[PDB]
Amino acid sequence: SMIPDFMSFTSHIDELYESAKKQSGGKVADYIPQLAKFSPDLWGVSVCTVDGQRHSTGDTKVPFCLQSCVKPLKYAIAVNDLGTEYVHRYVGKEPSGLRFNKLFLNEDDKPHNPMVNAGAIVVTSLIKQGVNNAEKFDYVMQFLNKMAGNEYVGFSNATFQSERESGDRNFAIGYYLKEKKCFPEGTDMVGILDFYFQLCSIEVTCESASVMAATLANGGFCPITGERVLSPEAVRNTLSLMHSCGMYDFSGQFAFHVGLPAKSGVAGGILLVVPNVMGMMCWSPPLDKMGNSVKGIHFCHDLVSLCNFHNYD
Amino acid sequence: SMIPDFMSFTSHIDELYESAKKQSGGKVADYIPQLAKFSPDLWGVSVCTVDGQRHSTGDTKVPFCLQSCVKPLKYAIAVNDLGTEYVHRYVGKEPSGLRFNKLFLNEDDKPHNPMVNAGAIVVTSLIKQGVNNAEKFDYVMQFLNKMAGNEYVGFSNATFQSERESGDRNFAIGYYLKEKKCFPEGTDMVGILDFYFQLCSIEVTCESASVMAATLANGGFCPITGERVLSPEAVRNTLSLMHSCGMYDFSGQFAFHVGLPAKSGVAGGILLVVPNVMGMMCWSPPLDKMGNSVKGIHFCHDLVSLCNFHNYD
Amino acid sequence: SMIPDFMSFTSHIDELYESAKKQSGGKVADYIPQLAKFSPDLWGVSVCTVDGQRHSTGDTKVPFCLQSCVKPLKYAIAVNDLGTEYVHRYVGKEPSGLRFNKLFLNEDDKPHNPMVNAGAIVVTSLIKQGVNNAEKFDYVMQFLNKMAGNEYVGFSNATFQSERESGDRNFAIGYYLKEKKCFPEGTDMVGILDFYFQLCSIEVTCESASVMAATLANGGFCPITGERVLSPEAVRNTLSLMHSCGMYDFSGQFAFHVGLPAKSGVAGGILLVVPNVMGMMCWSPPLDKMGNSVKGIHFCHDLVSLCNFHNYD
Amino acid sequence: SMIPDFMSFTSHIDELYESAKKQSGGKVADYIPQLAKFSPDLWGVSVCTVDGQRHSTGDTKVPFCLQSCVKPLKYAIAVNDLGTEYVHRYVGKEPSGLRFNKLFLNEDDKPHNPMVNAGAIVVTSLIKQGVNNAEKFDYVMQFLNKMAGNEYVGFSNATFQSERESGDRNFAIGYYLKEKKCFPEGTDMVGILDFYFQLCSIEVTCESASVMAATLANGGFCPITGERVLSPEAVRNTLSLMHSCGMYDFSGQFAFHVGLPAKSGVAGGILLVVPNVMGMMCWSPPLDKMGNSVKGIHFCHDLVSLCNFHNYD
Q: Binding residues for substrate, per the UniProt record (chains A, B, C, D)?
């Protein structure tokens, strides 16, 4: 209970929101039309406490693609169904670059961690093995529905189509992983890439995503349904890797000044988690050099300076 | 209050201690005689809660050198006296290797972080500038006394003499930093290295060190004196960097499975901090390939599995 | 005229051949059946002087695939038809690893040199642009025929089929180059990879290949037909890059002790050139850790110690 | 005899000299006053054939420090007295960066090659072991006198004093090599650095240096005295490593377009060798980004385009 009075806190969220609104820097991702379309002025913040209390300000009901934000979510699912040991048999846990700047794999021929494309691609191949992509996709959709307490969870076919058609780097990664036997026996690599592109194209709203974050903040229990969605083990692992590998190269600076588990996405979203307190989703298309939403980064630094949510405060 | 009953908890510390005692692997550091001397069977664990409650088991009153364990301590001192902004003008905050495996500096010509020699060396040059080494040394000694609530804090002249005489790598680092203008204007580099070697040679006991850790766990207040020793800012920064850069290359695996701020030393010590709960010091000379005490690493993994102290539990 | 008496020299080639024959180390490449099939005892050496004088010893009429040996040949063709400036607009000239160990591209997003797969793949895309692969292939075949003075130049469909079906790393490279716009406008990357696999599957004999080498040693004139096949510019460039990037990581040790332009291949072949004197082809399936024929490497070191052919002798 | 008529050739050297004279780019090295002093307009070229025929144009009698130009010379001396095998027990032969950009040592803890500071420093420690620096210095001076056929060979005490006083990077290298046991048993590292600084401070003129180059071009025989100065083995090794590691990072581009053994120096000198034809020394203080004399680089590219001296022409 670091939030004795929700109303007053809500009032502070609005002030912070308003302050970050003045930050107009950054560039909206434009490698595909579906991302370039977005207005640089879209800005929204949704909060969902461990209690189930809600608060939204700004453009919180405009759908956008999770993109990389889906990474910790599918990682959580894999750990939930397969266990920590099995999953990390295929992907690493190291947050460092190590001496592996832009390398698809580490010295042991394993993706560095679940938060980079190579890792997410490997994780994607571990979920619900043995069924067609249609079934795998439905499986994860149901899962995301539970995390969001049945709130908005859609799909962008146009993003999926464009992401796949222009994802040369991901295909390069897919073939290299095949070279090094990084997938489980009998994996259809190209088929896995399709599933990966689809997952990146799943849509949410600031409001529904915040519930997803709140579930991770509530030990794996959806705050608005009470249902156990993810195992404690899955949640703890996800938060650890989000804390260390979730904000691209800004992770170091982010962990030092913000000290919270988070995962950004090229659509401008930032899934934020305040363990045992609340889940949050900040969204604003304009990204900085590192690929993180400018307004989002600003907002997070401000949230911690004001409410002292840093893990080591 | 995650420790409702101190006595019962104490009983669990003994069981864990006993279990790690069976782990006889590792090699006692032997690059200098002062470290080689130590018996591989020395093993002790001291606990000091935020309350001021104490508990020790094993060889908790045998002096040993902090060595790298002193790094977060002098970093805390620098931040306390100079502030976050000034200090990081000279040293980085990145926990990753990045693509800088064994490099003395990063692309901006700054040590990666305060937890590696190059960084500690730079930090050492920022403390109490303008006075002779004798005065700087006394200054830090008084400081460590306050952190330990006036408990055991000694000095090993033999270690200092040997460390300096055989520290070629540190001298190489010292000259490279001089090359790149990494020190404050007018710094006597060789004189700074002496101070650095001296600090690494400061002695403590598991019992006194645990109080130091408890001070960091108590927001900067010594649990057994009530005195404010370090600013909140200094404590938070220290814990962040300990969490990410304190266990050498094992940091990644350590953060994932243990999730606690810690700093190891070549003497076999591991300064452990459980934020808002307790401070700890585990000591056992035999080190693993990574340079961390074998019994210590084992003990830490066990402590978290049993008492659920992981930051994301 | 460093070979006043061809007969006596021929006698020395036989002694060297015989001496290398005792070197039974190495492993026959076995990533595909077409390479694993080969007997580790196959060993042949063919010489073709700038005069047109010939000499063969051992298994000099057994067909084998050029594999990487074709790299300097297609590079020569590209330079011959397009010129030095145009070609190096797409591929580098640096022989070093630089700090790019196993990276597909350098900092300027260009393959390091024509002698590594990424470079050969790019070079392949520059030759005879605008026609179907059938026409490109015939074009290069005619070219290789001229270099060999119409001697044996075949094709292994089985090798081509296997190389393509198991070439995941090359496909990874193909997609990454597409990512970075490394190909000429309108290139069909997958179609280029097919052409690349085909070229690697071209067959020769020690005898025909030696004529090809002799052509490079004769300023671009086929020693046994007198026809100008390659421009002087093309020949000089090819020899420079062969000297520095032709023997995989052994290039450094090879340039120092042998000092001759050469290109090895996974089939066990080593295209050797002694500028203004002769061309040679050594073949022996067993490769060393670096991927070079064991008997071949031995033979080359011996040839230089005996006849003083080192470029700086 | 690629120079049938020396007079006409001499006439071409003047035209090339004149053409490079128009190249006013570059920056005169200024890390120490002794180098900053030099006028950016100083420009001279001296030629000394294997015959003993001479030709100079420009500022060919103005003393300047060999600096890095002395590297292949002391390497030659070491090989001459100790043999190839012994010397490379301490230093590598690899020309590549490998993945060792700015690293003092390679994976085997050996300097990459004799042409970089770490290597030159190691080589310096192998020459005339067991005598004081005064004796070592005299020993090398006599040696350089023989290479220059007793022509100008001086010493800059001011450069030596400044180089040593500001050579922090070299001291960093010196301590790191000591860390890794890179020197022969019982080496006085600091004493070796003094000797190294002294050697870099040896002075020559374009005219005397060209004779030194001619000696290397004449298989180790001083063209103007007939005396055997260096063993054939020493000369061949020196030329190989000059060809691949003598022009700093420009080596790759230099080997491709110029194809001649060369070694540059921060004073603006470029020791050039045309095997079996002539030795040359180009000097012009203004250096390019890579650290090579601008006029010198231009002149070399021109010399090869006109007279076809490229090793593979």
A: 68, 117, 163, 170, 196, 248, 266
